[PDB]
Structures are given as C-alpha cells and as structure tokens.
Amino acid sequence: AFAHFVLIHTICHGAWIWHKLKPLLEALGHKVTALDLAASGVDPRQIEEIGSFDEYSEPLLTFLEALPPGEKVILVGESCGGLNIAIAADKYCEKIAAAVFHNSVLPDTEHCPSYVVDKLMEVFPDWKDTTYFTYTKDGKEITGLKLGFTLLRENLYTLCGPEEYELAKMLTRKGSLFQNILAKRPFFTKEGYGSIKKIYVWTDQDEIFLPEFQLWQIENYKPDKVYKVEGGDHKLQLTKTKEIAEILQEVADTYN
Template sequence: MAALPLKEQTHFVLVHGACHGAWSWYKLKLRLESAGQRVTALDLAASGIKTKAIEDVGSFHEYTEPLLELLVKLPPDQKVVIVGHSLGGLNLALAMEKYPEKVVAGVFLTAFMPDITHKPSYVVEQYSARTPASEWLDTQFAPFGSVNAPLTSMFFGHKFLSSKLYQLCPIEDLELAKALIRPSSLFIEDLSKAKNFSKQGFESVPRVYVVCDEDLAIPGEFQRWMIENGGVKDVMEIEGADHMPMLSKPNELCDCLLHIASKYT
C-alpha cells in the first residue's frame, strides 16, 4: 500500500509484547527513521535491559510505567502514534485512557484490544478460555506476588517461540529471541480488578487494528472477534505475517504505519 505524503514528522512510540523488549523493533525502527520519522522503542518494566525482575512488579500499572512516564514528559504541543504489539495492546489502552490528549492514534498490531463494557482483563480471559493448555507447548507459568495480590509469571519456551510466534521469521531473529526474552506476565489477576476503560479516555482516541493473517499465537479469528467486540472500524491487514510482523514483514509494516500516520496526523 502506498502511504499518503506526511505533512510533518510523526513520533511513533513502539510498545513490545510479553517476554520481549525494545530490541524486537530493531528492523522497523530503522525503516521508519529512514523514512524521516521519529521513533521511540521502549522497554516496559522488567523487560529488555530494565534491571527489575517480573517478580518485583506488583501491578499492570507498574509494568506500564515507562510508557506513561514518556507521555507525561512530552511537550504540551506534541502528540504521538502508539503501536502496541500483542500484550502491548493493553499497555497502549492504559496510556490512551490516562493521556488521550497525547495520542494521535493507537495502533493495535495483532494485539489484545479491550473494550469499555468489560473489565480490562476480559479479552485475555477470553483468549485463555479458548486456548487449550496444550497450545502453550513448553511455555512456563509460575505464581508470584502476595496473597492479597497474586500474579502469574509467563516465560515462552523455545518450541512455542519457533512454532507459534516466529514461524515465518528469519532463523536469526528466532535465535535473537531465544537469547533475549525474559519472564513476563499477562497480569490477568490484577486487570480483573481494574476499572473499565472509558468512552472519554480510551475510546476517544482513534484506534486502528492491524491483522496478521498467519499469526498462530493470536489467531486471525480471535483478532477479528476483538475488532468486532471493540467496535473498531479502521482495520488493516498484513498478508503472510506471523505473530512478529516487525521481523517477518518489516517493510510491509512500515508502509502500513506510514499510511496510518498520514491519515491521522
């Protein structure tokens, strides 16, 4: 797809998914910057090169703090396009809820996308209910937190990475992931107690969903269910993309984001 000409530079903020970090955007960051855009790929708490461990993160809000802090520090006249991948869609939603005036558009890249009718945990709970335990393969889960605030950590296994997430990626990117992924959490227990997102906050920001049709982790059928459930009208699709389109289809994803920026900025 051909992107419309951008009148001015767009600031893209890239939010990774569970167990990943800013490193997962390395191909896309280069391409967007080469197209003249400003890009911030950040590590959420206990991710990437952050020193904190997931066991030291007490809530989803705390996990999201690096993104929220970035938005707070933006100059008053500056807005961003936030791209949330996979679990990062929920971090994106929290940021849109708290600082809607800072976000031009929220892009859900084969990501969990909540609604305003149910608890923030709803889509992840639905996903878990529809995903047999056997589908997680060698992914490891373990309890952490306190009696009053229990959480469950999650660490993708090598079989899960290769067959569910990276099956269409270059083998080098799979090896990079094996070396760099870290334990994370879906934060279902915490999100189930959180307030619903609102029409005035989260839903007031334009939302775009990007479908990846070869995704075996969050299948296309579930992606489209979330689109319908969330009432999103602006939907784009990257053909031949697995769960990691920033690595398997970086050129197509770059074109997609430039098109979105040209439409909303």
C-alpha cells in the first residue's frame, strides 16, 4: 500500500533532515510532505515570535486543516517531534492513520505535557557547548537554545558523514523546548491523542535519547508496535535511511 507520510523535524532543525528519507519513500510510491515548523528551516519567523510548542506546531496544524475530508496521513516525528504529534492529534485525530515516533519523545495523557521532557533532562542533563538565552512572549519567559557543534557531532550526528554534520552546523537555528509552557499546558486528551496508533522506532545506539530514557518511555506509555533498529545513531533517517523506509512501508501496510 501507499500512504501520505508527513515528516516532522525536531527543535532547531527543519525539513532538511529528511532529505535522504523523503526520496526513498517516494521511490516506494508514497506521497511525502516534509514540513518546516514555526521559526524552523527556511520558515520566515524567528523563535522570539513563538510563545509555545502549540504555536511552534502551526505549520503542521495548518497542513492537517488543509487535508480534504477522508484523507488520512501517517505522521512521522523525530526527537522532540512527538510533542508536535500529540498537539496535532488533539485537533485532527480523524485525519491521522497512525503516528510513528523516531528516536522521539512519547507524551502521554496521565501526566503533564512536560513530563517526558522533564525526564529527558534528568537522563541527559549536560548539553555540552549548547548555548541558552531567554526572551519574553505572552507574559512568559521562554528559554531558547542553540545546539552546540560538539553536541551535534558527538551526540546527535554521531555516526553521520562529515557532509551531513556540515548541513547541521549550517542549518540548525535557535529554538526552544518551551518546557515551562508545556508544564502549565492542558494535558493531552485520551479521546484525541490517546486514540491514535503509535509505533515507536528507536536504536539503543542513540547518544542523546539514551536507552534508559527510551525504555523508560516505552514502559510509561505502551506503544501499539515497537521497532528497534540495530546500530545507527540518533539521526536514523540519515544513518539507517533504508531501514526506516522499510519500517514505514510496513506501517503503511498495517495502518490506514
């Protein structure tokens, strides 16, 4: 079967991390949309204009709103992208055939929206040469960050080529986890987000979303299906592009 995949990047990244996976999925016959979220990739906004993870998710929400009745997509979110999936699923669950988490955070419905992020910051507290700043938006102080080049090299793009790591130094932009905003956000709902099919893809070789964090998430909120990719790194759509496309073909064949 063929599906319409909507690939969702993580904070500080853009559609560009999917540049190897998107042609591979199209060569299997799939339709693929790779979005730039707010203030991400070549989106015109700067991060200081964005006051929450929900505002950050506007390109994804606008995309789903534009789908005609009856058209369903499979959302694919990497790293912090699981939070965009959860926000989207609480507004457009009828339009989501399934959600695939790719070395991704997996929010739940029983604890606050920041819960899994608070746990990630406990398991991985040192983001090395990453710099931080603050800005004010809608009466709240938001902590912005710019991913450090050594963190990018060693923990996110560990086994990626020098030309792939070069794209990350050139294209990663200022972003935010909006952690304190997620902590006061209304919980994700059981009827929206809780109802969607959730496929969790990961590798135990991920150097930032470590096995203790990812196995903790799998135990916290049981996925419908789990795929473990052997080897690779945190950016599996770059180091294991073929294996991710094979898993996504199986999801397209299982969930519609």
